[PDB]
Amino acid sequence: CPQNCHCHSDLQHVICDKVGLQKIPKVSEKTKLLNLQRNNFPVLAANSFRAMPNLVSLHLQHCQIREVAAGAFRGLKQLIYLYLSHNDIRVLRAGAFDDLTELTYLYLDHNKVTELPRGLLSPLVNLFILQLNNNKIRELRAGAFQGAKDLRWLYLSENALSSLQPGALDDVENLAKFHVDRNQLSSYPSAALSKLRVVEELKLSHNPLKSIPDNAFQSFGRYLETLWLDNTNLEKFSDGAFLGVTTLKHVHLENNRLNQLPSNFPFDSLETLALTNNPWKCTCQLRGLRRWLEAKASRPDATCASPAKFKGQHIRDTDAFRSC
Amino acid sequence: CPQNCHCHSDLQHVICDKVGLQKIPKVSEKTKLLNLQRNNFPVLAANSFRAMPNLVSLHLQHCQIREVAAGAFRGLKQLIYLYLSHNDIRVLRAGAFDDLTELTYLYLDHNKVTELPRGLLSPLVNLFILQLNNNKIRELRAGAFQGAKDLRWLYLSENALSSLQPGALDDVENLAKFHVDRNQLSSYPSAALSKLRVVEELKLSHNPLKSIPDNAFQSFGRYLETLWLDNTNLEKFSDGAFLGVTTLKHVHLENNRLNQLPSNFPFDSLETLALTNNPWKCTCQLRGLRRWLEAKASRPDATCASPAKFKGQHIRDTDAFRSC
Ligand SMILES: [Cl-]
């Protein structure tokens, strides 16, 4: 057990949490968990973890890491978790994650990554979660996810994405969750998202999308269960926007400029619907929404904005749908 | 495997990181790690983790926990790690940690705890680390740590401690690290610290201590290796302050009002000494400091403030020690 660090006998855990380390310590070959959080490792040179074959979890958060050389993790074939959150990584070089065959969860959030280059994830064949929230990624170029066949949860919230290349998501067609909220997408990325086939959660909050085009959800219409479009400056849903959507259960439309919903809005499977803070127009087009709201026990405070006669009245209680 | 969460088969890990849970999920009885971070559990009632005998690690950070009822963790006999950081817990009454016999690491930092009552840690007989940084603790009453015989690392930085009752530390005489920096200690707590026998790191930065009395380090003089007294408004060391100190290696005195060092200042084992920003008076008292500075490499230096003739001169270069 290294100095300044503490070790649990039975568990083969090494704890070096904020113990002032400047170098990667030497540890037993059977070490299964190595916690090096809150230290100082500005550079992770190649073979930084040489004699650690049995390592299953490696925690390197808050280590002020600025450089990750190619092959830094070269010896860690049995590694399952890798936490690199809250460092100063600006570039992820190809080869950085070499020999991480069994890696399943990779956390790179709260760094300064600006790009995902081709082949970075090539050897990460078992990667299930890729956590990249709170970086500065501006564009996902083609090949960014080549090799990551097992990837299912992809988090890219709070970056600077202004567009998604049509080929950005070709290699991860089997994503289950895709979060790209709080970016700068100025329109619904039809080309990129049309490659996803089995998305269950799509999170697009806080992107000035303005509108949703036709066939937006076709490619994953029978898998999509949760949809976030809150604070997207949403003015309109295309009449064919929801073509092919059959199992949508939770939808967030709060804080937009929506006056109407399309005739084919899928209320059949809908379970929850956040829709407050919209200038709802209480006329006949909204009859679909009324019937659904009357059916549900939660009482949202979604009032009418127009026409003038019903302004202020709740959509659920108002008598504006008597003629329709 | 609960809904919205992912489970690793071989490791018996359950990951529910920010998946929107409102209640503690049900999991397999052999589950060894349960990650429930970034959820919302305002109340942890008794027996919240009933059928989890083999649970070894439990993560509840950022869960907006405001209340921990007695017996919340009643079934977790094999628990080793417990993370409760970054919640809104204001009170920890006795019984909160019942049946946590094997608990070794307890993180309660970044909450709003105001006091440590008697018997709170009674069943935590294997507790090694107790993290209470960034709370609002004002006073440690006698009995606060009764039962915590294995406790070695105690963090209390960033609280509101204005005094330590003489009996505060009786039960934890074997502390290795004691951090109480950034509090409101208006003087060196002689009575409380005199009970510690083997302290290796004592961290008192950012406390208006004003002075250090005689025998301040007597009871643990043969173990103290690192001492932080920076930003303590320190005017002087008592002539007997360093009685019994035999292995002091690292000392921080930066940002104080020190003009002199005591004759018995222990330079024998000293390796590092931060001493910048002090009104050093370069006369006969500082010769011990001069010789030590001359001996050390790349360990910069602080300038003289008096006498007037040597204002501005570095202690390492000055010629004020020729008549020694
Ligand atoms: Cl100075």
UniProtKB/Swiss-Prot annotation, chains A, B:
Mostly monomeric. Interacts with collagen type II. Glycans are attached at residue 122. LRR repeats lie at residues 54-75, 78-99, 102-123, 126-147, 150-171, 174-195, 198-219, 223-244, 247-268. Pfam families: LRR_8 (PF13855), LRRNT (PF01462). It comes from Homo sapiens (Human). Residues 278-324 form the LRRCT domain. It is found in: Secreted, Extracellular space, Extracellular matrix. Keywords: Disulfide bond, Extracellular matrix, Glycoprotein, Leucine-rich repeat, Repeat, Secreted, Signal. One of its GO terms (cellular component) is extracellular space. This is Chondroadherin. Promotes attachment of chondrocytes, fibroblasts, and osteoblasts. This binding is mediated (at least for chondrocytes and fibroblasts) by the integrin alpha(2)beta(1). May play an important role in the regulation of chondrocyte growth and proliferation. Disulfide bonds join 1-16, 282-324, 284-304.
